[PDB]
Amino acid sequence: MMFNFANFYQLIAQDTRLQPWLNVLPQQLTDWQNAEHGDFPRWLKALNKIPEGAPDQIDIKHSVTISNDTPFHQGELKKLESLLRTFHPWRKGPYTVHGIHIDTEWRSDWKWDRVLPHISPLKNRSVLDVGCGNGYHMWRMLGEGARLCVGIDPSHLFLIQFEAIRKLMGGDQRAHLLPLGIEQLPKLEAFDTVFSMGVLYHRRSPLDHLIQLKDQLVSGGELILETLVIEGDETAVLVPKERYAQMRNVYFFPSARALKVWLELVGFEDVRIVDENVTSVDEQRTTNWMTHNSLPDYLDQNDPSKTVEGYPAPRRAILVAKKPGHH
Template identity: 75%
Template sequence: DPTQLFLCQFEAVRKLLGNDQRAHLLPLGIEQLPALNAFDTVFSMGVLYHRRSPLDHLWQLKDQLVPGGELVLETLVVEGDENTVLVPGDRYAQMRNVYFIPSAAALKQWLEKCGFIDVRIVDACVTSTEEQRRTEWMTTESLADFLDPQDSSKTREGYPAPLRAVLIATKPETEQSLAAKKRADKQPG
């Protein structure tokens, strides 16, 4: 999250670890970045369902990758086929800012529509109350408080309980990137 709180946390951890300057945090959202085409791997974890335009978000992620780069996308999904997308009303699991929750199959299709290749669903599982729970550091409400007390397979709003999926996708190589790799392979030593 591009907030001062997360920047302060990052800097505190950096200081505890010896003030290593090899990693930096820029408090910017992806929508504020130009198309850098600079990263071998981009992670988007728990963000997609908070976006009003999920396809635009996928395009923004793709624009950050080098040709041949890899996207690791973790997000909420629902069960269903490639045409299944949940559009919750006012809230989903007590969150107000959830706009679209696709099935894993629909998300795979979205990634392919955005031009990604080799799209794989590498994990899909129920979000457990053991994973997301109150702790001595996080004492506010947690997943158990957001599920139907009579039926934990549903949220308090009556929607399916959270499922999480991880998909990995590749940005295709371009003729230019393939030519550059070929030249680099011919370099001695």
């Protein structure tokens, strides 16, 4: 055992639509325990030292912020910041936790602000965040009164990052992060909304990825799809020979208009392109909490409209679609 999913098993046991997941999940999480990880003992020691118990004040609507009415002992807060810094690098956020500003590489709040206007309201929806990161968005989803948020992300570190914020929220049992790939989920068809943001370009079969997403949605369930794109008509599809913005293991970068046809082919209805944004270096930068290289380093030093490799520079697109049938 690295980490005990006892409470998740309990949740999905008592869910009519998720119980069938127990037929495959526990053997996968058992095998994940046994693929031991160098840094997980250390990370755990730190997560255990993080103050237990509820905060007084929580805002997950306009931000992800945690405070107490009584200011917390300046000894315990210097220790907390120290603990949280053990989980470097901090890519998705930002978080303000008892007045510690976790300035994450990404302004993941901005991406949320772009998405929210175009989704069906999350009030009482079950959501899947595919490639959820440390689960920043799952917190914002609960902010809009989602019933339940399930994140999946292979990163051991992003699990510890999430369990840290969760512990500091007093162990909120309405969000969970499972250390799985999307390819490991069976055809659950259990979720009202599914988010897949920043995953498609990492997946060697994009069509199979769109189908795997469709397979987690109930009838008339809603898909938010966010991915890096290029400009063009339905025939515009960049597949890089080598790297794109210093990433390796990346595959398809279709135009928003091609991706819209792809989603239709696979069987989605009401497919809408609702935003195209060109990632600025104010949205993605190196920080105090993520000290590695970031977008400035990945652009052409003399042309920010291009990647170092010469390809069109990062452009993110949001598409929203319905799976066929009624809700």
